[PDB]
Structure 1
C-alpha cells in the first residue's frame, strides 16, 4: 500500500529526524510509551500509522525509519530521551569512529563494514512492507558523517533497487558562512556522485530560516528546536497526502514526474507560506490571496536567490486545510497575469496543486501560528545557478593552492576524482544556461 522508509544519516541529520517523528507522533496521539489509550486502533499494523509506524499485534508503534550515525554520544543521548522506547534499538545504527569531516573516510575506511549491517536492516524492512513507494533520506552536503556515509549507501540502494523513488533532503551549505573550509571539498564530491543516481534532491539553508524567525515569527534568538520543528512541519505537510486525503490526492510519483524538467537537474525549492506568529495570526486573518502573494514574495524563500535574476520552470503548492477550488484558481490566475514572475516560455503551465482538508495542528509548547489554510510551495528556477557558481570559485582558488590535500592523499585518494567533479559542475552550469537560454 502507501508507505515509505525514512533514513537519517549524519548526527546533524538525526536531531531533525527525531523532531519530525516527535511531530509525527503528535497528530496521531501517540503516547511516548508506544500504545494508544483504551481506544481501539491497534491491529496488524493497519491504520493511519500503517504508512508511518508499525503498531503490530504487539501493540507498539514501530517507526519505519533508520537512524544511522558514526559517533555514539548524540545517538546514545536520544536513546535516553522520552520516545526511545518507541524506537527500534538497532535501527539506531551508531558508530564508534567519525569520518573527521572527510567524505572518503566516511566512504571507504569504515563504510564497508557498516553498509552490510544496514543492508540487513533495509531488506528486513523491505520484506515486511507492501508498496514502499520510496525512501526519505535526511542528510547534509557538508556532513562530518552525513556526506561520505550517505554517498556509498545511496549507491548500493540504487544498484539493487532502481525501480522506486529516492527522496533526498540536505541542509544547503551557507553561501557566506562556513563552519569548515573542507565543507566545499566533500560537498562537490557529494554532488558529482549523486547526479547520476539521486531522484529528487531538496535543499534548505538556515540563515534565511533564521531571517524568517526574526522577521515574522519575531525570534531574535532561535534554537534548533525551532528549526527542527519548522522543517519537521515542512515534511509533515508534504507527507499529509499520505496520512489524510483531500479534494484531490497526489503522490511522490507525480512530484517526480511533474517537477523535474529533464535529467540531471532535480533540485527544486520548497517554501511554506503561513509562517506567522500566534498573536499576528490572532488579530489578523488568513486567505488564499495574501498567502499566495506571500509565498511568492522573494524574501520568504530560504535560499539566497533572487527569482528576478532567474526564470521559473516548475511550481507546486500543497494547500492543506479548509480551502475551496474557486478562490484558489482565480488567485493563481491572477498570478499568471503577474508580470514580475518570469516563467520560462517553454511551459504554459508549471504548477501542481495539492488540496487537503485537514488543517495543520499546533504542537504543545510550540511557537508557530494557528493555521487553518496552509500551503507548501515547491518550485524550481534558473535563479539557483549562482549557488554552485559561488561554490566553484571558492573551490578553484583552494584547489589551485590544493589546501589540506595532504589529509586526503594521506589516507588514499588522488586528484582525478577532484578533477572530474569540476567539469561535472561545469557541465551542470552550462546546462542551466542552455536550458536558461530559450
Structure 2
C-alpha cells in the first residue's frame, strides 16, 4: 500500500543499511530468520510471501566483495533475498572514473533489473531512500549512474538521499575533495532532497552525550538508522499528523538547486542519564537547535534557517509541541530568512522509538529535525577550497583521466559547485525590494 524502496551503495551505505534493517526488524517484530512470531504496518519495508517469509524492499549494491559477504555470512543470512544483494568482483578504489565510466556497466543492468522487479510488486512507491557516501568510488559514481537511470525510468518519483558528508577536519582519504565535487555536480540535477551527515560530528555527539569514548562504526551507523527510522515512520504507523516523503521534499526544498538540509536528533542519552532528566517535549525540541547535536559540523549561527521539519514520535502532546515552537520562534540566537515566517513543519507519530541491544535508551519521546539552512555554504566552501588547492597543479588527475573520463568534467563540476556557492548567497541575503 505505502512502500518505499531502499538502495544502499558502497561499503558505507551497506553497513548503514544493515543497521537500518536490524532496527526495522526490531521495530516490526521481524526476527533474523525471516518469519514473524505471531498489523499490516510491516508492508512499508518488508514484503509478504505465503507461509510468511517477510523479505526486505531494498538492494545493497557494492562493486567489491567482503562487505556484502559480511552480510550473507552474518546473522541476517536467511532474511535477505540472494539476488537482493549485489556483489561485484573488482573494487572501485576511490576513483569517480571507476565509479561512473568504467566499472558501472558490469552491474548497472542487473541493478536496474532488480529495481524493476521490486517496483513491480509495489502498489504505492512513495520513493527511493538512497544511502551512500561522498567518498569511495562505488558510493560516488555508481550512485551517479543510478540517479541518471532512475531519472529516465521513474522521473515522476521521489528520491531522498542520506549522504555521508566528508569530514571537514579529519577525513579518511585525499581524493574525497575530487569525489565530492564530481558526485555533487552529477547528482544535483537528479536529486530531490539530500540530508547530509558528518561522521566526526557524530563522533562529537557520541563522546559528549552517549559517553562512549571508544565508538565504532556500528555505533556510528545505528544513530543514522534511527534518523531514517524517525523519517520513514509516518507512512508505517498512525498518529496525530501524517507526513510523507513527497511532503518532506516539497517542504524542505525552496529552490531546485537548494535541496541540502541538515539532520539532527534528540534524546541522544545513554541509558544511565535518561531517567534523572525530565525529557520533556520542550527540551527535546530545544536540544535540536544547539550547535552540538547537529549531525554536520557546521554552525547554524553562521547562517540562516530556511526550513525545518520536526518529526515527533512517542507519547507526544501536540500542544506542548506548539508551545515549544512558540518559545523557539522568539529568541534571537535563532534567525530565519525574511521570506519564511512559516518555517516549521510538524509530524507526529504514535509509536515510541524502539531500542536494539546496544547504546541508546528506552525513550517514550523523540524528535528528529530536518533543518535546511544556508549555513551549509560554509561547509561547502571548505572542501571547495580543498578542491582549488588540490587542482592547482593536477594532483591525482592521471588515474581519472586515463581510466576514460574526460578532463573537462573537472572544470564543469568546479563551475557547477561555484555556481551553487553563488546561488546560496543571494538566497541568504535579506530582501531590500
Normalised to the residue count of structure 2, the TM-score between the two structures is: 0.97
Cα pair 2:242 2:347 within 8 Å, conserved: yes
Residues 387-438 of structure 1 deviation map (CA, whole Å, 9 limit, x = unaligned): 1211121111211111121112222233210001111111101110011112
Corresponding residue of 2:314: 321
Select 2:401's aligned residue among 409, 417, 421. 409
The 3 A distance-change label for structure 1 pair 273 and 37 is closer
Residues 359-388 of structure 1 deviation map (CA, whole Å, 9 limit, x = unaligned): 112222x21122111100110111111112
Q: Supply the distance in 2 between the matched residues of 1:279 and 1:404 (Cα, whole angstroms).
A: 48
Q: Supply the distance in 2 between the matched residues of 1:74 and 1:426 (Cα, whole angstroms).
A: 35
Paired residues, number: 430
Q: Supply the distance in 2 between the matched residues of 1:363 and 1:269 (Cα, whole angstroms).
A: 25
Cα pair 2:29 2:37 within 8 Å, conserved: no
Residues 150-171 of structure 1 deviation map (CA, whole Å, 9 limit, x = unaligned): 1112100111111110111111
Cα pair 1:98 1:106 within 8 Å, conserved: no
**C-alpha displacement of 1:208:** 1.4
**C-alpha displacement of 1:144:** 3.2
**C-alpha displacement of 1:105:** 1.1
Cα pair 2:96 2:400 within 8 Å, conserved: no
Cα pair 2:312 2:348 within 8 Å, conserved: yes
SS at match of 1:136: strand
Cα pair 1:208 1:301 within 8 Å, conserved: yes
**C-alpha displacement of 1:352:** 0.5
Residues 88-127 of structure 1 deviation map (CA, whole Å, 9 limit, x = unaligned): 0011100000112111112121211311111111111111
**C-alpha displacement of 1:335:** 1.0
**C-alpha displacement of 1:325:** 2.0
Residues 281-316 of structure 1 deviation map (CA, whole Å, 9 limit, x = unaligned): 122221012112211111111211111110111001
Q: Supply the distance in 2 between the matched residues of 1:327 and 1:430 (Cα, whole angstroms).
A: 40
Q: Supply the distance in 1 between the matched residues of 2:323 and 2:271 (Cα, whole angstroms).
A: 28
Residues 54-110 of structure 1 deviation map (CA, whole Å, 9 limit, x = unaligned): 122141011000011111112112101111101000111000001121111121212
Cα pair 1:101 1:143 within 8 Å, conserved: yes
Cα pair 2:2 2:236 within 8 Å, conserved: no
List gaps (5 residues or longer) in structure 1. 39-45
SS at match of 1:316: strand
SS at match of 1:309: coil
Cα pair 1:106 1:147 within 8 Å, conserved: yes
Say which structure is richer in helix: 1
Corresponding residue of 2:267: 274
Residues 326-364 of structure 1 deviation map (CA, whole Å, 9 limit, x = unaligned): 221112111111111110111111011011121112222
Corresponding residue of 1:428: 420
**C-alpha displacement of 1:322:** 0.8
Q: Supply the distance in 2 between the matched residues of 1:69 and 1:306 (Cα, whole angstroms).
A: 34
Q: Supply the distance in 1 between the matched residues of 2:156 and 2:32 (Cα, whole angstroms).
A: 35
Q: Supply the distance in 2 between the matched residues of 1:262 and 1:77 (Cα, whole angstroms).
A: 40
SS at match of 2:368: strand
Q: Supply the distance in 1 between the matched residues of 2:54 and 2:18 (Cα, whole angstroms).
A: 15
Cα pair 1:295 1:377 within 8 Å, conserved: yes
Q: Supply the distance in 1 between the matched residues of 2:68 and 2:318 (Cα, whole angstroms).
A: 45
Cα pair 1:12 1:140 within 8 Å, conserved: yes
Cα pair 1:16 1:232 within 8 Å, conserved: yes
Q: Find runs of 4+ consecutive structure 1 residues off by over 6 angstroms.
A: none
The 3 A distance-change label for structure 1 pair 105 and 248 is same
Corresponding residue of 2:161: 168
List gaps (5 residues or longer) in structure 2. none
Residues 218-261 of structure 1 deviation map (CA, whole Å, 9 limit, x = unaligned): 11110112112111111111111122111111101111111101
Corresponding residue of 1:97: 90
SS at match of 1:307: coil
Instruction: Note if 1:388 corresponds to 2:380.
Output: yes
SS at match of 1:72: coil
Cα pair 2:308 2:372 within 8 Å, conserved: yes
SS at match of 1:119: helix
SS at match of 1:352: strand
The 3 A distance-change label for structure 1 pair 288 and 37 is closer
Corresponding residue of 2:10: 10
Q: Supply the distance in 2 between the matched residues of 1:113 and 1:407 (Cα, whole angstroms).
A: 20
Normalised to the residue count of structure 1, the TM-score between the two structures is: 0.96
Corresponding residue of 2:31: 31
Q: CA RMSD in A?
A: 1.2
Residues 177-197 of structure 1 deviation map (CA, whole Å, 9 limit, x = unaligned): 232111111110001111111
**C-alpha displacement of 1:274:** 1.0
